[PDB]
């Protein structure tokens, strides 16, 4: 399999072994009533860093949790600090696939199109080889 | 965790102003909510190890008014109900390691049932 | 509030003329077709700048709106003809800011409906809240 | 007539004396009869200071072709190197207004909303005085 | 006729030569048709003049994008990994028209308006001479 497929699968699995919710392999664009709670594992900004002649890449690893419609940002944090944060401390699979990992950001996005969901995004900055 | 407290501190500060408060930028608006006051964070981001895990975020306090009102009305509201409360919020002061003015923007409903002013500061803290 | 004083210092000045336009105190979102020619005065990216100081930098805008089926040349003409003169000197505006300088001259249009065509003349100013 | 007005005219005129629908400024929504359309406009015009008791400026000059419906980008290039390029070789009137000219880019843009129209945009960076 | 046309084609031709499977596009499609999927578009973006060298040299981002509807990214990787990377492995016809090619990024994009499709975008940074 391609290295990106392995990446998310390492996280995704660590998520199932653990959390009553529906997961997606990649940022979804739409959901069905039945998808919430939703947790998407995906990558963004994958880029080739090696021009010091290294094959080295870097990317933003995403674990975004979606909740149905309009909820407070604190309900998202609770879900984040109670069903995700923990799982992101022991995921040996992930370790073996990457060369470095570090906390990146923590964003809040919402469906500014059809107000169907509110989300919290936990992202790490990673480095690896294709 | 920590962002709930941060946001909360300010929400409880502005609590004590007949407006409708929102913990995190709203998406859709039911006009009963106007004047709407939202408190949220943008660009929260890890910044390294001091010993203690540092983070930096952007704290927002945006006031929304129904329809298309003249920016000034927004400033007026902002000058009368928001700044006063912002001058001193100990609860907040205790959760942060530093705070400082960032900017002041005027946004609006591009797709137009509301216009707004959004006060911001840059805060640093430990998660 | 300074932002309000600034825009005002500019609005009146500019609207003290026979200009048969409509003036807005802020970048409007929805335009009634009966609102053109339109003239809006607003600020963007106001940021605190401070070295310890109360410097605040912002971008002053004077946008001219006209029906979307109009050549830029016309907007250009509208600009040289009614705004530039007035903008050459506004003592009310001067006594509020600590510096002003030409910045840009952009061209915009309504991408959805396609109801208007505009020209945005901007300056960079500095001041203290 | 102010500088920008004169700048566009130069190119505008050149294009006329030589055969589609020309617009003085980037248009928003076209009418079936507008194709093929060519737009000559400016973007990013900014003051770069004063040189010597004179007001200096920089801007991007655009000559954009719009072809009816979604078409291969190769059709655009073809139309481009056939009607546009030649005229651009040397436009006196223009050179007599500017202070410096050089090629910037060649961008492809489409009607994201619908296959309404496809376009190839040829740009230059110029410096002039107001 | 001109360079951008030869560039895309070298890629397009190499790709169909390898796997006629999808419907290829010369440029980035504005809108698709239920049938086209799988879609594979070959295009350039940000082509900018970088100067003269005794010859005028340009720079641009070459794109090979695979569109599928809203399916998991790993499936996009999988198509990318078996219908694309092998070809891109080395394409003489292409290399023969440029000066340098380097890997840039791997972006996952998607339909935002109607969720009609989801894609994987493979990009290389290339230098050539008009």
UniProtKB/Swiss-Prot annotation, chain D:
InterPro entries: GpU-like_sf, Phage_lambda_GpU-like, Phage_tail_protein-like_sf. It is found in: Virion; Host cytoplasm. Its main location: virion. One of its GO terms (cellular component) is virus tail. It holds the Pfam family Phage_tail_U. SUPFAM superfamilies: Phage tail protein-like (SSF143749). The keyword Secreted does not apply. GO terms for biological process: symbiont genome ejection through host cell envelope, long flexible tail mechanism; viral tail assembly. Gene3D superfamilies: Phage minor tail protein U. Keywords: Host cytoplasm, Late protein, Viral genome ejection through host cell envelope, Viral long flexible tail ejection system, Viral penetration into host cytoplasm, Viral release from host cell, Viral tail assembly, Viral tail protein, Virion, Virus entry into host cell. Plays an essential role in tail assembly by capping the rapidly polymerizing tail once it has reached its requisite length and serving as the interaction surface for the completion protein. Homohexamer. May bind to major tail protein V, and /or tape measure protein. Belongs to the lambda-like tail terminator protein family. This is Tail tube terminator protein.
From Swiss-Prot, chain E:
It comes from the Viruses. This is Tail tube terminator protein. Homohexamer. May bind to major tail protein V, and /or tape measure protein. It is found in: Virion; Host cytoplasm. Keywords: Host cytoplasm, Late protein, Viral genome ejection through host cell envelope, Viral long flexible tail ejection system, Viral penetration into host cytoplasm, Viral release from host cell, Viral tail assembly, Viral tail protein, Virion, Virus entry into host cell. It comes from Escherichia phage lambda (Bacteriophage lambda). Plays an essential role in tail assembly by capping the rapidly polymerizing tail once it has reached its requisite length and serving as the interaction surface for the completion protein. Coiled coil: none annotated. Belongs to the lambda-like tail terminator protein family. One of its GO terms (cellular component) is virus tail. InterPro entries: GpU-like_sf, Phage_lambda_GpU-like, Phage_tail_protein-like_sf. One of its GO terms (biological process) is symbiont genome ejection through host cell envelope, long flexible tail mechanism.
């Amino acid at each position: 399999h391609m290295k990106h497929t392995e990446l998310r699968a390492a996280v995704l699995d660590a998520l199932e072994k653990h959390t009553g919710a529906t997961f997606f392999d990649g940022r979804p664009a739409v959901f069905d009533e039945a998808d919430f709670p939703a947790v998407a594992v995906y990558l963004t900004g994958a880029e080739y860093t090696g021009e010091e002649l290294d094959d080295t890449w870097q990317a933003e690893l995403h674990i975004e949790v979606f909740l149905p419609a309009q909820v407070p940002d604190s309900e998202l944090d609770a879900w984040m600090e109670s069903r995700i944060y923990p799982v992101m401390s022991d995921i040996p699979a992930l370790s073996d696939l990457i060369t470095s990992m570090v906390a990146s950001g923590y964003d809040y996005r919402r469906d500014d199109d059809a107000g169907l969901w509110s989300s919290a995004d936990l992202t790490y900055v990673i480095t690896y080889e294709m």
